[PDB]
Write a structure and sequence with these properties.
The structure is a homodimer. The first copy, chain A, is of the alpha/beta class and about 575 residues long. The first copy, chain A, folds into three domains: about 200 residues, FAD/NAD(P)-binding domain (3-Layer(bba) Sandwich), CATH 3.50.50; about 270 residues, FAD/NAD(P)-binding domain (3-Layer(bba) Sandwich); about 100 residues, Oxidized Rhodanese, domain 1 (3-Layer(aba) Sandwich), CATH 3.40.250.10. The first copy, chain A, contains 14 helices and 30 strands. A five-stranded parallel β-sheet of chain A has the order 3-2-1-7-18. In chain A, a hairpin with a 6-residue loop joins β24 and β25. In chain A, α1 runs parallel beside α8 and α6 packs across α14. The radius of gyration of chain A is 27 Å and the shape is globular. At the A-B interface, α1, α3, α8, β21 and β22 of A face α1, α3, α8, β21 and β22 of B. The structure holds flavin-adenine dinucleotide (2 copies), coenzyme A (2 copies) and chloride ion (2 copies). One chloride ion (CL) binds next to α13 of chain A. Chains A, B: This is FAD-dependent pyridine nucleotide-disulphide oxidoreductase. Chains A, B: One of its GO terms (molecular function) is oxidoreductase activity. Chains A, B: Belongs to the class-III pyridine nucleotide-disulfide oxidoreductase family. Chains A, B: Pfam families: Pyr_redox_2, Pyr_redox_dim, Rhodanese.
C-alpha cells in the first residue's frame, strides 16, 4: 500500500487524487485543504459577483463527503500543512479550528498549493476596503464590502484576465469603475495593437481606463459621521465603511469606495523552500518533465511550479487551469511508476472583454524580440462566418512565424465571435508542428452560419506564405509614418472611405481604377500601398510588381494602423 | 501572353481567374459562364428562401463588370462551351442568346463546370411543382411556386445537407413539411447513432420525417376549379397551380403542393467525355494532384472532379466549396508552372439542423467497415463550456481510431453549441498526423463563457487512450442487448434516473455506494457496466477491475444507447 499525501484540494491536487484512486484501490490517499472547500470553480468567482452565475451552489463541485463516497479519498478541510520533514517522510499539519498540530507520514507527496495574489509595497494598501480575489471567502469579503459600503465607484488595479473580469463584473452591477494598468496595455499575452480593440470596447462602456499608470499610495479614511433620515439628510450616497483616497504615479488623486488588487499571482513556495526543494529563477518550484521536484518522492503541479515553454523550451510561469488539471492527472500516473512526460506549455488563453473575446497562444512579439528570435507577422480582418449570413463579426487575427522555416510562433485574435475556435485551431497546429505553408491546406467546416469557404486561418496562411515565397513585400504599421524620399504613399481605397481616416500625404487611386491610371505612378519610386484591411492592397501590389514596380503593402491595412495608436 | 480559358464562373473557376491575374498582368483570361451570374453564394440560396438572408443582392459577390475592373478578366455570361478539340487547342462556344457558335483557342483550359442535381427515373417527376436547387434561377422558380401555388404543405426528398436546409427553410415560412429519405438516416457523413439526435430535433419541430422510404411515382393534377369570393367560397387554402399526388415505396399516398428534389449531385462530365479525357470509377473527371486531367494542357477542379481521400488515398466525390476554391487557386498556380500538389480531402462538413449543428470530418464507421479497416470508437457527452456558466449545451462527440496505432480515422459531433469548433480542431489534428495518444496533450482555450478546463476533445482523447492502453474495456450500444450467462448487467445511475429509461434486467448499484456494496456482485461473472454518459461507468469499472473482477463499460452510456434506436 502506498500512502499518498496531497497538499491542495483544487485543480492540481483534486485531479491527482481522483486519477490516483482509478489507478489503484489499495492506496491510502489523504488530501489536505486549508480552506473550507475542495474542487470549487475559481474561474466562476467574478461571474458570481456580477450575478451572471446566479447561484452560490454552482461554484462547489465536490464535497469532503462526495470525495469519500466516490473515490475513498480522505479530504481534510481546515487542515493546513505547515512543514515537510523530508528525511523522516513526515508532514506537520495544523487544524485551523483550534490551532492544534499533528504529523502524518507519506510514501509520496504531491504539492499543488497554487499561487497567491501579489502584495505590492504600496503604503496603506492593507485596509478594510482593499481586496484580492483568490477564493470563495475573498469573494464573500468583496461582496460584503460592496453591500456594506454602498459601493458607487470602484477602482481595479491590473489589466490581466482577473482584473478585466472584475472590471466587467462591477460594471455589471452599475458601479462606475476605474482600471489602472502600469503597462501600456491590458492583456499582455496579446500585443499592444491587438489590445487597442479591447481598449476601445472598454472605453465605450464608460469605464475610466488609465494605462501607463501606477498606484503609489492608498489613504483609508474611517467614516465618522453616519447620515440619517431622522436628521433629514440624504443617505443614498453614503459610505458607512469609509473612503479611499489613492495617490497615482503622476500625483493625481482618485477617490473610491473599493479597491480590487489584481496585479498577478506568485507561486506558493514557502513549504517547498523550508524543505530545501529547488526553486527556479522565476520563483516557482522546479520540476522535471515528470512533474518531480528536487526530492524524487515529492511531485508538484500547477500554479506553484515553473513549466517549460512549448516554443522556446525556457522556463515560464503560466497560471491556468487546463495545464494544472492535466499535470495533476499525469503526476498521479508517475506516482504509480508510469514515467509519463509533460510536453511543455503554449499558454493558450482567452478572456471576455464585454462583447469581445481576446485570445492568444504560443509567443507574442514582445517575447520574441526580447529572446532575440527572428520573426515575421501577418494581420487579417475577416468575417467570423459567411458575411451574407446574419450575425457575422470581424475577427482580427495575428499570426507570428519564422519567415524562413515557416515555424509557428504564436497567434492572437480579437473580436465578437469565433475567437475561441481560431485560437484552438492555431493551438493544435502549433502543437502538432505544422508550418505556415501547411496551414494553407487546412480543411475546416463550412456552412453559412458557422464558417466561410476560406477560413480566417486559411487567409492568414496565404498572406504569410506569400511573404515567405517573395510574392508579397510587407510594410507594417510602425514603419509607415516614416517614409523616405524614394517612396510614394498610395491609398487604394475608394474616396468616401478617406473620411473615416487615412494617412497624411496619400495619393488616392482606387484599386478598381488602378490598371488604367497607373501611368500616373512613376516607376523610379517604391510604391507604398495601403487599403482598409490589406486585401485590396495586395491586389494593387500584385498589379504593380507584375508591371515592374518596386512596392510594399501595409499588412492589416488601415484597420490595424488605426487600432495601433 | 499565355491565353487561359476557364469554363464555369463560380467557386472553382472564379477563384482560379482571380489568382491567375495576381500571378500575371500579361496573361489573357476569358471565363465562360452559361448562366447570367458569376461568383454567387450557392450556399446562401436556402437561406434567402426563408428570408433568413433578406436581400437577393447579398448572394451576388461579383459581376462581369467588377471582374473586368478589378482583374481584367473577360467574363462571358450566357456563353456555354459545347466542345473541346484537344489536339487543335480550340473550344467551340455557343451564344445562348442566338444559338450561334464560334471557336476560341487556348494555351491552357480549366474545367470547373460543377455538378448537376441527380435526376431520378421516377414516372411523373418532371412537372411545374417539382424543382431542384442548384442556382439563383432554380431558387427563383421555387419562390415563384411557393407564392403562386399558396404552398401550405411540401415534400423534400433527400436527407443530405441541401435537403435539410430546404426543410428548415420551408418550416421557417410556416409551411408543413415532409422529409423522405431512402436511407435509415439523415446526413450520411455521420453515423446512424449520431443522426438520431438530428431525427429527434427534426420531429420535435413537427416535421413529418420518413426514413427508409422512397418516392415511386409522382402524379401532377392541374387545378380546374378556381374558388372565388364572388361565388361565396373560401379562397384561403386553394392552390391554383395544381396539386401533387406522390406514391411512396410502401404503397402510401402523400398529397402536397410542392416537391423539392435534393437527392445529390452528379459531376458535369459530358464535355470531358466527348473530348476523350479520363473519367474515374465514381463518374468524375480524373485529375492528378496538380489538378491536371489526362491532357496536360487541361486542368479541372471542384465538384466535377474525383478527389483523393486524405485517410485512405482512394477516390471519392466530395461536392464542397472550400475544396473547390483552394483547388481553383492552385490550378492557376500550376498553369504558371509552380507544380503545387493538393493534399487530399477529409470531407470536413457541418449542417445546421434547427437548433442543432451536426458535423464530421474524416471517415465514418460505415465507410471503415466497407473498406475492411480495423477501428475503434469512443463517445463522450461533455458540456460545450463550463456548465456553471449560463448557456452551456451538451456536445455529443464520436472519435474513430486505430485501436493499436492510435491513427485518427474520423470524428463526428452533434449539439446546440460548439460543434464547428470541435470538428475544426479534429480536422486540424488529423491533417497534421496526430494520434489519439497525442490528442491528450492538446492545450485549448479556457475561460467559463468559452470552454472547460478539460475540453470535449481532451476527454475523448483520454477515453480512447485508456482503451488503447488496456485501462478500459469497452462494450458498445449494439452488443449490450445481447449478453451471455457469464455476464451480469450493472446500472450505476442513481435510482431516480431509471425512471427516464433503462436496460431491462439491470442490477442497480449507484456508483457512490458501490465500494461498500461490492460484495453483492459475484466475481465469477463479467460485470457489464453502464451509466448515463459513460463517465460514472468508468469510475465503477476501475473499482471492479482494481478488485480483480472482469468488467466492461458501455461507451457513451445510456445516452448513446437511447439515441441509437
Ligand atoms: C478569479 C480567478 C479566475 C480564473 N480564471 C481562469 C480562467 O478563466 N481560465 C484558466 O485557465 N484559469 C483561470 N484561473 C486560474 C486557475 O484557477 C488556476 O490556474 C488553477 O486553479 C491553479 O490550480 P492549483 O491546484 O495550482 O492551485 P489552486 O486551485 O490555487 O489550489 C491550491 C489549493 O491549495 C491550498 N493550499 C495552499 N497551501 C496549502 C497548505 N500548506 N496546506 C493545505 N492547503 C494549501 C489553497 O488554499 C488552494 O485551495 C483563475 C483564477 C482566479 C483566482
Ligand atoms: C444549395 C446549395 C447549398 C450549398 N451549401 C454548401 C455549404 O454550406 N458548404 C459547402 O462547402 N458547400 C456547399 N454547397 C456546395 C458548393 O457550392 C459547391 O461545392 C461549389 O459550388 C462547387 O464549385 P464548382 O466551381 O465546382 O461548381 P459551381 O459553383 O456549380 O459552378 C460551375 C459553373 O459552371 C457553369 N458551366 C457548366 N458547364 C458549362 C459550360 N459547358 N459552359 C459554360 N459554363 C458552364 C455552371 O453554370 C456553373 O455556374 C452548396 C451547394 C448548393 C447547390
Ligand atoms: C473534477 C475533479 C474533481 C477531478 O475529477 P476527475 O474524475 O478526474 O475528472 P472528470 O470528471 O473530468 O472525469 C475525468 C475521467 O473520466 C473519464 N471519462 C470522461 N468522460 C467519459 C465518458 N463519457 N466515458 C467513459 N469515461 C469518461 C476520463 O477518461 C477521465 O478518467 P482518466 O483520467 O482515468 O482517464 C477536478 O479536476 C477538479 O476539482 N476541478 C475543479 C476545480 C478546478 O479545476 N479549478 C480550476 C479553475 S476553474
Ligand atoms: C471571391 C472570388 C471572386 C475569388 O476572389 P479572390 O480575390 O481570389 O479571393 P479573396 O477575397 O478570398 O482573396 C484571397 C486573396 O487575398 C489575399 N488576402 C486576404 N486577406 C488579406 C489581407 N488582409 N491582407 C493581404 N492579403 C489578403 C489572400 O492572400 C489571397 O490572395 P492569394 O490567392 O493570391 O494568396 C471567388 O472565390 C468566388 O467567386 N467565390 C464566390 C462563389 C463561391 O465560392 N461560392 C461557393 C459556395 S458559397
Ligand atoms: Cl482592403
Ligand atoms: Cl455517467
Amino acid at each position: 500500500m502506498k500512502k499518498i499525501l496531497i497538499i491542495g484540494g483544487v485543480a492540481g491536487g483534486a485531479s491527482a487524487a481522483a486519477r490516483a484512486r482509478r489507478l489503484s484501490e489499495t492506496a491510502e490517499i489523504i488530501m489536505f485543504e486549508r480552506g473550507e472547500y475542495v474542487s470549487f470553480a475559481n474561474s466562476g468567482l467574478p461571474y458570481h459577483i456580477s450575478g451572471e452565475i446566479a447561484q452560490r451552489s454552482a461554484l462547489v463541485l465536490q464535497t469532503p463527503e462526495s470525495f469519500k463516497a466516490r473515490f475513498n479519498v480522505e479530504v481534510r478541510v481546515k487542515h493546513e500543512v505547515v512543514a515537510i520533514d523530508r528525511a523522516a517522510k513526515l508532514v506537520t499539519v495544523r487544524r485551523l479550528l483550534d490551532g492544534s498540530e499533528y504529523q502524518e507520514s507519506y510514501d509520496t507527496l504531491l504539492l499543488s498549493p497554487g499561487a497567491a495574489p501579489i502584495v505590492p509595497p504600496i503604503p496603506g494598501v492593507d485596509n478594510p476596503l482593499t481586496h484580492s480575489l483568490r477564493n470563495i471567502p475573498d469573494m464573500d469579503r468583496i461582496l460584503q464590502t460592496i453591500q456594506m459600503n454602498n459601493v458607487e465607484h470602484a477602482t481595479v488595479v491590473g489589466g490581466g484576465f482577473i482584473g478585466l473580469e472584475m472590471m466587467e463584473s462591477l460594471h455589471h452591477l452599475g458601479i462606475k469603475t476605474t482600471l489602472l494598468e502600469l503597462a501600456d496595455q491590458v492583456m499582455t499575452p496579446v500585443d499592444r495593437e491587438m489590445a487597442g480593440f479591447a481598449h476601445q470596447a472598454i472605453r465605450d462602456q464608460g469605464v475610466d481606463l488609465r494605462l501607463g499608470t501606477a498606484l503609489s499610495e492608498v489613504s483609508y479614511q474611517v467614516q465618522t459621521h453616519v447620515a440619517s433620515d431622522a436628521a433629514g439628510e440624504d443617505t443614498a450616497h453614503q459610505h458607512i465603511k469609509g473612503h479611499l483616497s489613492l495617490t497615482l504615479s503622476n500625483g493625481e488623486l482618485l477617490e473610491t469606495d473599493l479597491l480590487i488588487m489584481a496585479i498577478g499571482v506568485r507561486p506558493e513556495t514557502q513549504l517547498a523552500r523550508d524543505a530545501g526543494l529547488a526553486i527556479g529563477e522565476l520563483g516557482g518550484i522546479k520540476v522535471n518533465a515528470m512533474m518531480q521536484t528536487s526530492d524524487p518522492a515529492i511531485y508538484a503541479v500547477g500554479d506553484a511550479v515553473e513549466e517549460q515553454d512549448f516554443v522556446t523550451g525556457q522556463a515560464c510561469l503560466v497560471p491556468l487551469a487546463g495545464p494544472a488539471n492535466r499535470q495533476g492527472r499525469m503526476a498521479a500516473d508517475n506516482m504509480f511508476g508510469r514515467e509519463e512526460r509533460y510536453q511543455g506549455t503554449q499558454g493558450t488563453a482567452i478572456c471576455k472583454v464585454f462583447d469581445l473575446a481576446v485570445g492568444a497562444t504560443g509567443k507574442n512579439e514582445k517575447q520574441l524580440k526580447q529572446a532575440g528570435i527572428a520573426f515575421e507577422k501577418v494581420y487579417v480582418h475577416t468575417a467570423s462566418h459567411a458575411s451574407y449570413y446574419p450575425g457575422a463579426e470581424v475577427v482580427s487575427f495575428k499570426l507570428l512565424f519564422d519567415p524562413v522555416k515557416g515555424t509557428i510562433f504564436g497567434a492572437q485574435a480579437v473580436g465578437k465571435d469565433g475567437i475561441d475556435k481560431r485560437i484552438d485551431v492555431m493551438a493544435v497546429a502549433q502543437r502538432a508542428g505544422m508550418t505556415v505553408e501547411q496551414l494553407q491546406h487546412l480543411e475546416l467546416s463550412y456552412a453559412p452560419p458557422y464558417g466561410s469557404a476560406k477560413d480566417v486561418i486559411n487567409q492568414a496562411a496565404f498572406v504569410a506564405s506569400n511573404i515567405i515565397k517573395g510574392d508579397a513585400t510587407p510594410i507594417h504599421f510602425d514603419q509607415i509614418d516614416n517614409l523616405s524620399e524614394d517612396q510614394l504613399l498610395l491609398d487604394v481605397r475608394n474616396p468616401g472611405e478617406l473620411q473615416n481616416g487615412g494617412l497624411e500625404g496619400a495619393v488616392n487611386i482606387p484599386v478598381d481604377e488602378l490598371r488604367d491610371r497607373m501611368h500616373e505612378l512613376p516607376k523610379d519610386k517604391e510604391i507604398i500601398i495601403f487599403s482598409q484591411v490589406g486585401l485590396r492592397g495586395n491586389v494593387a501590389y500584385r498589379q504593380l510588381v507584375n508591371n515592374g514596380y518596386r512596392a510594399r503593402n501595409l499588412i492589416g491595412g488601415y484597420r490595424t494602423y488605426k487600432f495601433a495608436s
